[PDB]
Design an enzyme around this catalytic site. Structure first.
Site, PDB file in Angstrom:
ATOM      1  N   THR A  96       1.406  -4.127   8.881  1.00  0.00           N
ATOM      2  CA  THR A  96       1.442  -2.910   8.118  1.00  0.00           C
ATOM      3  C   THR A  96       0.199  -1.996   8.310  1.00  0.00           C
ATOM      4  O   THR A  96       0.358  -0.856   8.703  1.00  0.00           O
ATOM      5  CB  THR A  96       1.784  -3.251   6.680  1.00  0.00           C
ATOM      6  OG1 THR A  96       3.210  -3.581   6.631  1.00  0.00           O
ATOM      7  CG2 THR A  96       1.508  -2.045   5.810  1.00  0.00           C
ATOM      8  N   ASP A 105      10.197  -4.354   3.308  1.00  0.00           N
ATOM      9  CA  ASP A 105       9.273  -5.399   3.696  1.00  0.00           C
ATOM     10  C   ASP A 105       9.095  -6.497   2.624  1.00  0.00           C
ATOM     11  O   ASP A 105       9.128  -7.695   2.928  1.00  0.00           O
ATOM     12  CB  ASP A 105       7.941  -4.790   4.005  1.00  0.00           C
ATOM     13  CG  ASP A 105       6.885  -5.828   4.411  1.00  0.00           C
ATOM     14  OD1 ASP A 105       6.839  -6.228   5.608  1.00  0.00           O
ATOM     15  OD2 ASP A 105       6.089  -6.228   3.523  1.00  0.00           O
TER      16      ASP A 105
HETATM   17  O1  LIG Z   1      -0.187   3.978   0.262  1.00  0.00           O
HETATM   18  C1  LIG Z   1      -0.212   3.216   1.269  1.00  0.00           C
HETATM   19  C2  LIG Z   1      -0.612   3.724   2.653  1.00  0.00           C
HETATM   20  C3  LIG Z   1       0.191   4.720   3.256  1.00  0.00           C
HETATM   21  C4  LIG Z   1      -0.284   5.180   4.549  1.00  0.00           C
HETATM   22  O2  LIG Z   1       0.488   6.076   5.227  1.00  0.00           O
HETATM   23  C5  LIG Z   1       0.045   6.590   6.488  1.00  0.00           C
HETATM   24  C6  LIG Z   1       1.100   7.625   6.937  1.00  0.00           C
HETATM   25  C7  LIG Z   1       0.538   8.285   8.209  1.00  0.00           C
HETATM   26  C8  LIG Z   1       1.438   9.496   8.491  1.00  0.00           C
HETATM   27  O3  LIG Z   1       2.661   8.929   8.981  1.00  0.00           O
HETATM   28  C9  LIG Z   1       3.339   7.862   8.243  1.00  0.00           C
HETATM   29  C10 LIG Z   1       2.392   6.936   7.380  1.00  0.00           C
HETATM   30  N1  LIG Z   1      -1.396   4.726   5.162  1.00  0.00           N
HETATM   31  C11 LIG Z   1      -2.116   3.768   4.560  1.00  0.00           C
HETATM   32  C12 LIG Z   1      -3.350   3.400   5.311  1.00  0.00           C
HETATM   33  C13 LIG Z   1      -3.346   3.540   6.799  1.00  0.00           C
HETATM   34  C14 LIG Z   1      -4.178   4.523   5.964  1.00  0.00           C
HETATM   35  C15 LIG Z   1      -1.771   3.226   3.297  1.00  0.00           C
HETATM   36  N2  LIG Z   1       0.137   1.923   1.136  1.00  0.00           N
HETATM   37  C16 LIG Z   1       0.507   1.141   2.314  1.00  0.00           C
HETATM   38  C17 LIG Z   1      -0.452  -0.023   2.622  1.00  0.00           C
HETATM   39  C18 LIG Z   1      -0.877  -1.120   1.597  1.00  0.00           C
HETATM   40  C19 LIG Z   1      -0.297  -2.511   1.941  1.00  0.00           C
HETATM   41  N3  LIG Z   1       0.340  -2.960   0.674  1.00  0.00           N
HETATM   42  C20 LIG Z   1       0.967  -4.260   0.616  1.00  0.00           C
HETATM   43  O4  LIG Z   1       1.217  -4.693  -0.531  1.00  0.00           O
HETATM   44  N4  LIG Z   1       1.252  -5.062   1.842  1.00  0.00           N
HETATM   45  C21 LIG Z   1       0.070  -5.730   2.541  1.00  0.00           C
HETATM   46  C22 LIG Z   1       0.200  -5.682   4.104  1.00  0.00           C
HETATM   47  C23 LIG Z   1       1.556  -6.188   4.442  1.00  0.00           C
HETATM   48  C24 LIG Z   1       2.171  -6.617   5.698  1.00  0.00           C
HETATM   49  O5  LIG Z   1       1.619  -6.484   6.958  1.00  0.00           O
HETATM   50  N5  LIG Z   1       3.409  -7.082   5.408  1.00  0.00           N
HETATM   51  O6  LIG Z   1       3.616  -6.942   4.088  1.00  0.00           O
HETATM   52  C25 LIG Z   1       2.545  -6.397   3.470  1.00  0.00           C
HETATM   53  C26 LIG Z   1       2.482  -5.982   1.973  1.00  0.00           C
HETATM   54  C27 LIG Z   1      -0.401  -2.337  -0.411  1.00  0.00           C
HETATM   55  C28 LIG Z   1      -0.621  -0.914   0.077  1.00  0.00           C
HETATM   56  C29 LIG Z   1       0.641  -0.122  -0.341  1.00  0.00           C
HETATM   57  C30 LIG Z   1       0.479   1.408  -0.263  1.00  0.00           C
HETATM   58 ZN   LIG Z   2       5.072  -7.461   5.622  1.00  0.00          ZN
END
Ligand SMILES: O=C(c1cc(OCC2CCOCC2)nc(C2CC2)c1)N1CC[C@@H]2CN(C(=O)N3CCc4c(O)noc4C3)C[C@@H]2CC1
Ligand SMILES: [Zn+2]
Ligand SMILES: *[C@@H]1O[C@H](CO)[C@@H](O[C@@H]2O[C@H](CO)[C@@H](O[C@@H]3O[C@H](CO[C@H]4O[C@H](CO)[C@@H](O)[C@H](O[C@H]5O[C@H](CO)[C@@H](O)[C@H](O)[C@@H]5O[C@H]5O[C@H](CO)[C@@H](O)[C@H](O)[C@@H]5O)[C@@H]4O)[C@@H](O)[C@H](O[C@H]4O[C@H](CO)[C@@H](O)[C@H](O)[C@@H]4O[C@H]4O[C@H](CO)[C@@H](O)[C@H](O)[C@@H]4O)[C@@H]3O)[C@H](O)[C@H]2NC(C)=O)[C@H](O)[C@H]1NC(C)=O
Ligand SMILES: [Ca+2]
Ligand SMILES: [Cl-]
Ligand SMILES: [K+]
Ligand code: NA
Length: 804
Positions: free
Chosen positions: A159, A261
């Protein structure tokens, strides 16, 4: 610490983040525990649900409600998304026939179509088809807009690396988020999902889309949502910001969904419990579109529906344990799961040895479900090495599998049925792309492409100049109705010399020997071959351009053409066409150890046989394969010292099979092929052509530099009913970048016949022409009849060798 004493009145989802200790009312406030006391009450209203009903219609506004069904809601921009449908007899967006959006149909004072980027975590590509029945909104976007059958994530297919690649157009190795979990030895800090450290700015390199937007005067809607803000509220907030005055309204917006996911981890990619999360995502998209339609914005906004990676079936029992391989298990740290990264537990332990660890991990069990690598020996297509956060020792894990250090880890840390993170060519890791709106084409399917490409296109959609990135700008022009980017060809930096015959045989003292002693019909004929009379046949797309300062020659021959480097003493490229009817012959024995001086090139600019004789580890091969010479007389050309390259015996087994057997096979299957082969030098594993002073290894006692890899680019007609050399239309390409290695430890089957393992090795090291450009500083396909955009697409193509 915040003075959380302040209020969120008229500040709900403020666009600028305020400086602590004044309290914050932005969509990220919770994740920093910095919200104002009243935040939930004012900004996270829930009263009365997310939908109008017949009886809430024309109601008197009640500020406590989650969303409104009163008359004024529209102007105020805060109706429930289904208001007009329930109260005004409108239809849902999903129920309308689609109609080409030829031009942006926007409210007065919109300077550009807004872009909404709707990202869905773990949305596997095959869900578009397999869940098409329960996703009608997404199905309408897909079939009405522009879609790919799938989109290729970056490795590792986690992610954080993928979301940040979407934001930046960079490989993880360049943007720095090289995993969900990481140790930076320079900062001596760790980055984890749980915790504060990930919020620190030194983790995040490149220039993400929101920064690019701001720097160029395009207002960006805060991309990030605190996890407990519910979906409906994210949607409504976006619809709200879209009603803001022209001078404050963002032009770009992001929605992120944790689903599918989150469920896919618990239940597997296709668990029966997976239908509901898919239905819920579609309902969210439905609310967005209905809300856009209410604001008359549904033919104005460009919507991108995009995943970060897919999801594979993975369970506890499919775990490999390093404690089954290594006696020394507690002196190492493992980053575990669907990939492995190993380092020393303690860098005061001088007795730690990576070589011995690699060796204890190589080809040990008959069906070993991981393969260890020095990072620089990983497939170049992964671009996963040039970062101090990437450990020297890597484990590429088989799909469906996990690696752990000790069994204790797996049951004292089954719970999960799905995971992802594997090699990005893996089918189950593929994700989605749909673009819908005035700037995207109508009812158009595009070929699969890589997500490193999208940053450039989101920059185009917003009129921004992209920061330097790993996309190839223009290779996705065919997704767009307009705002295309019209790139020019990089200018050639070095022009070749064309040497004639300038040296006598006896000026060469090279320790090279050849048994080669033998009219006017065929003496004029050999001379014209050397002047370039068959160059039209073997050089189909122009000669490659050399994009750096160097000194080289074009060498013409009956069967092949080459650009020979006077600096690296070998060709940069060798080009030849093998038609469908061509025949393989053997190397005669009056010729087995024959190497002939090339009378166009000085002794001083030549390799010598003596160095190969002295060098006990290093041997040599040929770039144009003698097996495929067109006549006994042409075959001598294949033995010129200027066609010779350094090759380990172990690698020659690979190369000889490719040249002797596979090339003919591709010519049969593809109706002729054009081949360009050559060496690559990437000693610092940055993915970029080394300069001469970067070369770590030479053939013993000489100046002949040893390549780290060997490439080939194999081109034909996409319409295979026409021979590669008379092709009227688009082209078809596959390429590889083979590691030049003194053993075959990578192929566990290698003590068998090459027909058993060579081809599998080559498949694993499949490449894009673009990868080879970076590694060589050459620019291919200069002279075609094709559009440049169509050529950029071809150069970014990767033959993955996965089934359908
Ligand atoms: O707000 C966001 C978010 C958005 C976003 O967008 C980028 C846009 C670019 C334009 O184009 C399109 C996208 N960039 C980011 C960071 C890269 C800057 C964060 N996030 C997503 C990530 C983390 C993981 N998460 C989690 O529980 N997993 C942890 C990691 C993980 C895994 O690998 N499998 O399950 C899981 C569950 C918590 C948090 C949720 C909210
Ligand atoms: Zn995942
Ligand atoms: C994918 O696309 C990307 C983006 O285009 C390509 O990466 C670029 O490649 C360029 C060529 O290698 C590289 O250029 C170098 O930049 C150095 C200055 O860079 C800083 O400023 C930029 C601009 O804003 C910034 O983005 C950089 O950010 C990096 O650094 C920090 C990590 O500390 C991170 O936050 C960030 O993630 C990023 O890290 C990545 O890049 C670096 C290299 O820059 C890697 O080491 C990391 O592991 C990571 O992958 C920088 O903060 C500049 O100093 C370099 O110039 C040296 O070399 C030449 C020799 O000719 C000379 O002209 C210079 O004077 C200098 O030499 C002197 O110093 C040498 C080294 O210290 C020393 O050996 C000599 O003796 C000399 O005295 C160079 O111009 C560019 O920075 C990156 N950009 C990014 C964002 O990655 C990438 O190549 C593409 N990949 C493929 C396969 O195509
Ligand atoms: Ca390099
Ligand atoms: Cl990781
Ligand atoms: K030798
Ligand atoms: Na082997």
């Amino acid at each position: 610490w915040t003075a959380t004493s302040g209020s969120c009145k008229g500040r709900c989802f403020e666009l600028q983040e305020v400086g602590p200790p004044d309290c914050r009312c932005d969509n990220l406030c919770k994740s920093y525990s910095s919200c104002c006391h009243d935040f939930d009450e004012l900004c996270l209203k829930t009263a009365r649900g997310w939908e109008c009903t017949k009886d809430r219609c024309g109601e008197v506004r009640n500020e406590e409600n989650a969303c409104h069904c009163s008359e004024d809601c529209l102007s105020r921009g805060d109706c429930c998304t289904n208001y007009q449908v329930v109260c005004k007899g409108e239809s849902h967006w999903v129920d309308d026939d689609c109609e080409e959006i030829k031009v942006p149909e926007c409210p007065a004072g919109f300077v550009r179509p807004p872009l909404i980027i709707f990202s869905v975590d773990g949305f596997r590509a095959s869900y578009m088809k397999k869940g098409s029945k329960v996703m009608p909104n997404i199905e309408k976007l897909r079939s009405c807009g522009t879609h790919a059958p799938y989109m290729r994530p970056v490795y590792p297919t986690k992610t954080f690396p993928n979301l940040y690649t979407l934001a930046t157009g960079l490989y993880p190795e360049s943007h720095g988020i090289v995993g969900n979990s990481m140790y930076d030895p320079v900062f001596d800090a760790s980055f984890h999902l749980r915790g504060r450290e990930k919020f620190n700015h030194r983790w995040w390199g490149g220039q993400p889309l929101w920064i690019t937007a701001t720097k160029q005067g395009v207002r960006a809607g805060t991309f990030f949502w605190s996890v407990s803000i519910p979906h409906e509220r994210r949607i409504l907030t976006i619809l709200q910001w879209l009603s803001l005055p022209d001078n404050e309204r963002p032009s770009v917006y992001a929605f992120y969904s944790e689903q599918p996911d989150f469920s896919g981890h618990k239940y597997g990619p296709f668990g029966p419990e997976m239908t509901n999360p898919l239905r819920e995502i579609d309902k969210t998209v439905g609310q967005l579109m209905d809300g856009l339609k209410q604001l008359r914005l549904h033919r104005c906004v460009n919507v991108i529906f995009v995943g970060d990676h897919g999801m594979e079936d993975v369970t506890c029992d499919r775990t490999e344990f390093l404690s089954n391989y290594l006696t020394n298990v507690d002196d190492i740290t493992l980053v575990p799961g669907t990939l492995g990264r190993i380092r020393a537990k303690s860098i005061n332990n001088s007795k730690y040895d990576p070589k011995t660890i690699i060796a204890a991990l190589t080809c040990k069990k008959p069906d070993q479900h991981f393969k260890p690598y020095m990072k620089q020996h990983l497939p170049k297509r992964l671009h996963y090495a040039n970062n101090r956060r990437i450990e020297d020792i890597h484990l590429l894990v088989d799909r469906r599998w996990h690696v752990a250090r000790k069994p204790l880890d797996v049951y004292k840390k089954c719970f999960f049925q799905g995971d992802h993170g594997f090699d990005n060519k893996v089918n189950s890791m593929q994700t989605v792309f749909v673009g819908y709106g005035p700037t995207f084409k109508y009812r158009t399917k595009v070929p699969p492409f890589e997500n490193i490409e999208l940053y450039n296109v989101m920059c185009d959609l917003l009129g921004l100049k992209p920061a330097p990135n790993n996309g190839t700008h223009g290779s996705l022009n065919h997704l767009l109705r307009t705002n295309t980017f019209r790139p020019t060809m990089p200018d050639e930096v070095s022009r070749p010399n064309y040497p004639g015959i300038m040296y006598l045989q006896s000026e060469f003292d090279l320790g090279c020997t050849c048994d080669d002693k033998v009219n006017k019909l065929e003496e004029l004929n050999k001379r014209l071959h050397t002047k370039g009379s068959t160059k039209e046949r073997h050089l189909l797309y122009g000669r490659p351009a050399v994009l750096y300062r160097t000194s080289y020659d074009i060498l013409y021959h009956t069967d092949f053409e080459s650009g020979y480097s006077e600096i690296f003493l070998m060709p940069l490229w060798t080009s030849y066409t093998i038609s469908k009817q061509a025949e393989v012959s053997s190397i005669p024995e009056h010729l087995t150890n024959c190497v002939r001086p090339d009378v166009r090139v000085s002794p001083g600019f030549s390799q010598n046989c003596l160095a190969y004789k002295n060098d006990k580890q290093m041997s040599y091969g040929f770039l144009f394969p003698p097996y495929l010479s067109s006549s006994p007389e042409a075959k001598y050309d294949a033995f010129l010292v200027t066609n010779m390259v350094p090759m380990y015996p172990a690698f020659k087994r690979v190369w000889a099979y490719f040249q002797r057997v596979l090339v003919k096979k591709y010519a049969s299957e593809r109706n002729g092929v054009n081949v360009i082969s050559g060496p690559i030098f990437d000693y610092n594993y940055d993915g970029l052509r080394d300069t001469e002073d970067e070369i770590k290894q030479y053939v013993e006692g000489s100046s002949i530099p040893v390549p780290t890899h060997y490439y080939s680019i194999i081109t034909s007609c996409l319409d295979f009913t026409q021979p590669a050399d008379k092709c009227d239309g688009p082209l078809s390409v596959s390429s590889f970048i083979l590691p030049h290695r003194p053993d075959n430890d990578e192929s566990c089957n290698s003590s068998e016949d090459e027909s058993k393992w060579v081809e599998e090795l080559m498949k694993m090291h499949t490449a894009r022409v673009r990868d080879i450009e970076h590694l060589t500083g050459l620019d291919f396909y200069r002279k075609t009849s094709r559009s440049y955009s169509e050529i950029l697409t071809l150069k970014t193509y990767l033959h993955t060798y996965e089934s359908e």
